[PDB]
Symmetry: T
Subunit: 165 residues, 12 copies
């Protein structure tokens, strides 16, 4: 059946994306610098925990429908399909920019996956909607730092050495 194939594909692809996000949030947690370093250090820890919890649920849902889960380092690298986080000290505006985009792209892809599996496997779809919920919430939490308002454009000039982000 390509109803098991559909399920596996959607779960496995989401798992890898969450694992990529685990590694990038931690990396940023450690290396972020600037005015918002501590704020972001704390926020990224919370995201990491939420992402880790859903990575474990997604992997065990995969096992639950009868397939092994591939969480290997090689598999994470092989699925790049997503900008990589710079090494070294990272700037607060750079971290914000980076996750605004990553969470948005990951959320979009999960959104597609929910549609794909919804009538063959509504239980897997339900799980993926929960993952999408958290990813899009995290997206807002990064986006909110640069959100345009009636009194202030929020260009990020102050967290970016005078320059818009």
């Amino acid at each position: 059946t390509e109803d098991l194939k559909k399920s596996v594909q959607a779960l496995q692809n989401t798992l890898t994306e969450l694992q990529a996000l685990q590694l990038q949030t931690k990396q940023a947690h450690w290396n972020v610098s600037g005015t918002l370093w501590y704020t972001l250090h704390e926020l990224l820890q919370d995201h990491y925990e939420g992402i880790s919890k859903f990575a474990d649920d997604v992997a065990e849902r995969q096992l639950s429908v009868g397939a092994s889960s591939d969480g290997r380092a090689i598999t994470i690298v092989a699925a790049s399909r997503l900008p990589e986080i710079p090494g070294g000290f990272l700037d607060d505006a750079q971290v914000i920019q980076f996750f605004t985009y990553q969470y948005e792209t990951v959320g979009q892809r999960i959104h597609q996956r929910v549609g794909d599996v919804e009538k063959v496997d509504p239980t897997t779809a339900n799980l993926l909607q929960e993952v999408e919920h958290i990813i899009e919430k995290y997206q807002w939490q990064m986006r909110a730092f640069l959100q345009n308002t009636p009194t202030d454009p929020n260009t990020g000039f102050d967290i970016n050495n005078g320059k818009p982000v």
Copy 2:
């Protein structure tokens, strides 16, 4: 007796002000944007919980001296007597400005109320002093973002698109 009338007036007026503050802190919690969005999101959650706890105490003190408590939406609107929080995305400096002022005006009014009821109802006065304590603490916590220091005026230029707040 206008010793029950005094007590009711002081308690009821404080209740409505706290309920107005519940709604405005939550609104700001959701909609705040900019460099300090997350910081303020967390701080406003703490204030909301403190305000909610005292709203419940004030309402039940009113019941305790023998009068019903009016916590209706219509009553909150009817007591405006206090600037309203803008809708839409709100800027961090705008939120700070707004609560610096609201908490100050609410604290002042409670201060007056403590004097009013102190010898007819010292138990109600004691409660209102506790409310004033928390409101003025919250006032300092908003004020501290723009507090002038020997090395830095803290105009809020960085959180306000180059302009003093």
Copy 3:
């Protein structure tokens, strides 16, 4: 897109209804009287906490799909579209009657909203199903006080001064 418009409408309308319910449950929590006053005081506190939690989730889901959330007192009043709770001391049977109806009407409307947004935004639909779940559970918990049984009609005569409710 009127897929963002659909989502915003469903989320915003639900938020206001939950906020209306926050205010009415608390009001009843304070002012309820009679044989079941304490029972209802405790039950209404539990409902208030459940409703408050989902109000926060609904507002932040709205932010998560890119729109501000309107939780203002004026907006609650403006959306009346729902009977208002009496002021003053409220009778236990009156509170029961009132929420049986409110929860039922709010649950119905959320039910409609779930259908409306389900294929444009299954993640928002999932959240609203969770809200509907709790609202309808609360509906049963109010309804159960007057539920007709094989041995007893449960007219509420005992909690209503000899008269059916």
Copy 4:
């Protein structure tokens, strides 16, 4: 030895009675209606937890003296030897009446069992005294709703549509 037979009989018969009580308390927890529905819903949850804990202790005491424990649905039905709880919506006075009687009859039987095994197996007797303690406490908690006092017969007329229970 009919000292193991004695022990097994007393433990097994008590286990089945507790399991019958697990099912009836939950059933009543869900279906109770009327003025005391919520009160009883909460009280029956507490009883269910206490009963469940002792069912587990009784079953594992049976294993501890070297015999398997029969907790099957068929065995519960086979040991009826005890009125069955009506299906459908149940009235508060009906639930109270029902458990007043069930707890009393179960407590009596355990009381007999304590005497039976006390000198062959004082450790099993000790456990059964603890079960009897809780069952008789629960009996008082149901009985107390209809307990005659110097100022009021407590006929249950108010929770029974004008009629004594």
Copy 5:
């Protein structure tokens, strides 16, 4: 000094009243019967804990200003100056009636005591205001069972065998 005498008198008299209330709430906790027996059993436990906590604070405030505290059974009996709770099974309406009155009279007396010691010993006055706060809250919680409303007089006929309380 009769500023220590004033303080001692106010503290000691309050201690005895709280201890009288400890004994009466527990007695009622055990012996209450009728429709509201369990409700009142739980409510009276909460009051007992609040009263016990303040009895300990009042006694240790007495020690703190340099005097021993008399918490003896003989002293409780000697200070009757307050209706005694009936023995035997007590009816729910009887318990409600009884504490409505006791809490009211105790609250009144503490209120007087606050005035008496307020300028010689504002710290003792502060403590007594906290005791008055809780006692009057408990008074409302008993009073609320019989509170007259626009739709229902709440005579207590249902919890009193057809007769107003």
Copy 6:
């Protein structure tokens, strides 16, 4: 309406299956023997708690859409429609075999039920997807003991006296 009939049928049938599973997991918890007795004793306790929690949710969802819930022993026996667990001491491989199958069949049936009620009652469907999620997870947890791998068939010979399971 046969939209309430649909909902009731799906909820009621699931409730009975969960209650059957409550009884069988506990039975196995007590009576399991062999190399994996303690492992399974602990695992079956965890399943029992998860199953019990969802049984309570399913029963109260049934009440929430306006129908009583039938959790009686007779009803559990009447719905057999599912192999019964042996009495006496049960072998670890026998327990594993038994639940691998039970959880699989129960999960399948819930899966069908989700489809059945999904557009008349998406809130009930959502609940049943959560039940299916847990049941299928539990299925994997039993299946994993005998799961074929590249280095070892996992026949269960070691937990079955030399014989494949």
Copy 7:
């Protein structure tokens, strides 16, 4: 039956003794002075909590076998039958002496009561054995301060102004 009379007598007499002990331990908790004041203040708090817990169990066991419980102040005074604790500041050696004796006499009496009711009411006997257990443990904890050892008589001279206790 004088098997209910036996049970009531044993339970009621124990309740009063525990309540007497509640009042005396608290009194000593507040008023104790000297080298061991703080030690004893803490120890007496622990005893008070243990005694309070068993007073509640004894009273509710009395209700459980169908009789009201008399916890009134007048009843405590009426059952003196036991030395009274001095008022005023109490010396550490005096407190130790006093409870060594009280706990011993109360433990003895409960011991007799266990024999009295053991075959009419083994469940009540079991409870009273638990009370005796704690009372005799508390007796050792007071006795241990003056316990004669091979290297030191422990006369209490140091806690008694040079004089043996």
Copy 8:
């Protein structure tokens, strides 16, 4: 009196046996090896905690009836009267065999002791029944690994290098 002698003997002999068991369970906790090493490591930790708790209760019951408790290493060695646990790495089947026997022999002896002291000291008998309860439960938990079933003899061949245990 040889009623104190009886009590002391029963308590002291049980204490030493529990202390012997403390040392053997820990030893096995550390040194166990094989397929069931981790399972047994965890199970033996739980037993150790239960045994330690009762050792403390038994020793303090001894003090409570007026005698010192001998918990010395020399006394443990002197009371051997019980097979000693091998040193070095211990096999899972060896640990299981060993405690099946130890717990059984210790439980038997405590059982005798309960009879011995039951009418001179029912409070000490009650404590020893609680110790026997736990010891026999632990006995079942070890025995269950090798328990014969209708589908599998459970010889332990798999945990014993092909050989029955």
Copy 9:
């Protein structure tokens, strides 16, 4: 205004005294010796925590009325105005003597301060009454070690090498 000056003076002077007390209680916590060393080590830890909590409240009340708080080491030294605690190993009687006096003098001064600010700033007065409450409680807890009783002068001879304190 010298109503802000009054408030600042009272708050600042209390802060410094509490900080002096933080340092002295810890110093004594570490260095106390003798019969009551451990008792006092524990008691002084509790006082330190209570004092630290109020130091933080006093400092933040100062900020709340618009002034900075001076908690510097130099400021603590500059406000000596209070005996200094000896260095080196400190004797139990010396610690008791020392805090009996310190707490008394600090409590007195706070008492004066409460009067000073009570009508310009009742909220600050309320806070200072809470500080006075704890300081005077701590005073009793030190005083109680040497408190004269009808049976024993409590000279402290035993904790002072034969000599009255």
Copy 10:
């Protein structure tokens, strides 16, 4: 300085090894199969948490001595220098074999690193000793499954389809 270079090298190399171990333990947690699947699932979760905690400490120690931390997926792959865990369903004996070896090799390398940095950076050495402690403990916990004993070689034949591991 090549004292910062030394520190960075030792910390960075350890971080990557811990991150490799995070991924492999989770992978095994999900995919392990066979008799010991659940046991190992639980054990590997505990190891994962311990490893994750030290990965965070090692990365933040690196930041603490002034260097960024590289936790990227590419860096984990680039440092292979260590056998990779198979994908697909993994057998219990295979998991045990695999971590016995991995933990041993990682522990050895950390051991070397402790020597390397010990006198330039004893604080980093201290941290690495703590990491080595946990890694070697985990090594024993895997090794213990196959540990040779006087009564049983523990070849793993039972967990490996008749064949030694």
Copy 11:
């Protein structure tokens, strides 16, 4: 011996530095102002707790090797040997600058002390390495606000009124 002298010197000097840091972190906690006031208020509270915990460990290690600990205010002032924190309102950039430097200098000195005592007193050295660990971590946490990155120098211009820090 000047091995006790060495130990005392290293411990005592570290204690004073930690106590200086306790006072400065709290001072900054209260008085910090500007964009990062709340962030720093929270961060400085965490540091204060970590510093307080190690101050207590260092003082009690000093006692453990047989010397008293000097924690007096005079001793803190006497050891200045370290810039003092300004009084009045302090700017966020000023606080960051100040602790970046203080933590660095304190960490350096502890580092030296670890070398000094390492072979006379490795247990004291171990403790001091733990103190150094936390101090240097806190140093990074302050330093990270101004850490230069590839996209942004992080001069602190935004938190310093346009000027580099």
Copy 12:
């Protein structure tokens, strides 16, 4: 290798000493008498828990470097090499004297062991430094009861029947 021999010797010898201390602290916990009996009862419980925790760590470190741990009663007796605690009732001064000495001698020996294994096994050395830390802290806590001060020799005359200890 005699680097494993060194490690084993140091770990095994420490384990036995900690186990000896477990037994002696408990023995003293039970049997201590006199003025400081309760104080010491509590203090010795805390030491016992700290000692037990490190005994478990030391034994599992031994396993971690590849050797079994000998925790047998016979081995404890065989390693006497340390005064034995008297049986019977023990005097407070005797307990203090005894542990002052035991902890000192055990701490000394561990100190030697740290030197012995430090460069072959720094991870084992680190663990032993932690054990030494706690043992020497416990030594101070016993020593502090008799510590000579400028105002009082602390001979223990008061806790020793007039005689210096």
